[PDB]
Design a protein around this nucleic acid. Sequence first.
DNA 1: TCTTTCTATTATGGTCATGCTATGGTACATACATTCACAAATGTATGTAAACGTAACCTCTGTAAAGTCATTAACCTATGGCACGAAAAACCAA
Length: 105
Amino acid sequence: TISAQVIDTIVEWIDDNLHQPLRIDDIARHAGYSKWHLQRLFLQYKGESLGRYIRERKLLLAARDLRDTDQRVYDICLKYGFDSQQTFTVFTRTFNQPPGAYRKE
DNA sequence: TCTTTCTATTATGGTCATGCTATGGTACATACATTCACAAATGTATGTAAACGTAACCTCTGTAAAGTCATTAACCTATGGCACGAAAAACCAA
């Protein structure tokens, strides 16, 4: 029990939520835990900054949609959180693996 | 040895219930005691005082437990400072 069961709710919010980005103000509210209700968790349970963990989660989620043989490549990053194609093109810094070649795999 | 013509007790119901009640007389004289009904006195009786004790009973000071508020410092919004991870510019390979 950390901050009255915030771990059991963060995962549910990440699962249920739409492609809306996750920031301090966005998740600070209906979360039931403010900035410090999340800082301790991100420091202890995860040990990684939000901008990298969210990007990794989006990449792991899109790894299946890229294999689902979808022709609308521009909408793949949009349906998962990346509001722009250039920002998602994160993939170069993470995998150094072609968008298209991976999409071909 | 046996069936008719006489001499005497049982029997047939109560339910719905009725008024107004007696009917003739036929001797006294002594007698002695049981019983009812009142005088008057006893005896236990009832109702009026007076003494002790606690049914107590409020009053007040001390012991005790319960709400609250002096400390003091634990954490917690702030402030400043330094990594950190994203986003765009740049340049190289094909």
